[PDB]
Amino acid sequence: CVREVCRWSSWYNGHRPEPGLGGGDFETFENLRQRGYQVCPVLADIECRAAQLPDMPLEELGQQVDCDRMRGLMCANSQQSPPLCHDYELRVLCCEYVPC
Amino acid sequence: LINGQREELPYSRTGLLVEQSGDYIKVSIRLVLTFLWNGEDSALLELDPKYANQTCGLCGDFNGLPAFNEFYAHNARLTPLQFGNLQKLDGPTEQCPDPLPLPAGNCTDEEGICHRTLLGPAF
Ligand SMILES: *[C@@H]1O[C@H](CO)[C@@H](O)[C@H](O)[C@H]1NC(C)=O
Ligand SMILES: [Ca+2]
Ligand SMILES: [Ca+2]
Structure with missing residues (x-):
């Protein structure tokens, strides 16, 4: 037999967004691989949040962040008013198949 | 591609020749610019003097002052990552990230090859 065993990951805050116009947070799976953070090739769903505000969700922030299961998280300074971002992080879900 | 059509090098027209x-592949637009492109890494632009101070991009402002006017946006001095990211342009349906700073360096010029050649008689 073979059954899927799946679990969440921990929190990954690999950058601190920079003040200015081009600044922000760019937490990408390729950057995660380069920095040595373990990146699962296959996944089901991922969760992004603000690291300094661990309660209020993303939509309650109202800031322009794009966060997707294929790429990761991106917040650009120039797209928000004031032209800044918060310090975000994210976590992923890894599932393997274990013999029964 | 010239105006959306592939062309066989060289392609020449009034003012333009590629x-x-x-x-390399060289594109010269007379009184405008000279563009050399080795096709793998290098790419070099020669511009007319008349575009002094009226340009903006990774190539700089072409005003003649190197150290004071490139990286100062809204009076704030900024960094190569910031400067190269300000001059960004996504595709119509593309959201490219911003590359993160690379960690510290190593190696250096141990055998002196860079110092032996660059400082050598050749130059
Ligand atoms: C160059 O551009 C700056 C930007 O405003 C301007 O203040 C300066 O007068 C210009 N000088 C020349 C020689 O073009
Ligand atoms: Ca971060
Ligand atoms: Ca300048």
């Missing part, structure tokens, strides 16, 4: 000259 060629496979030498080791």
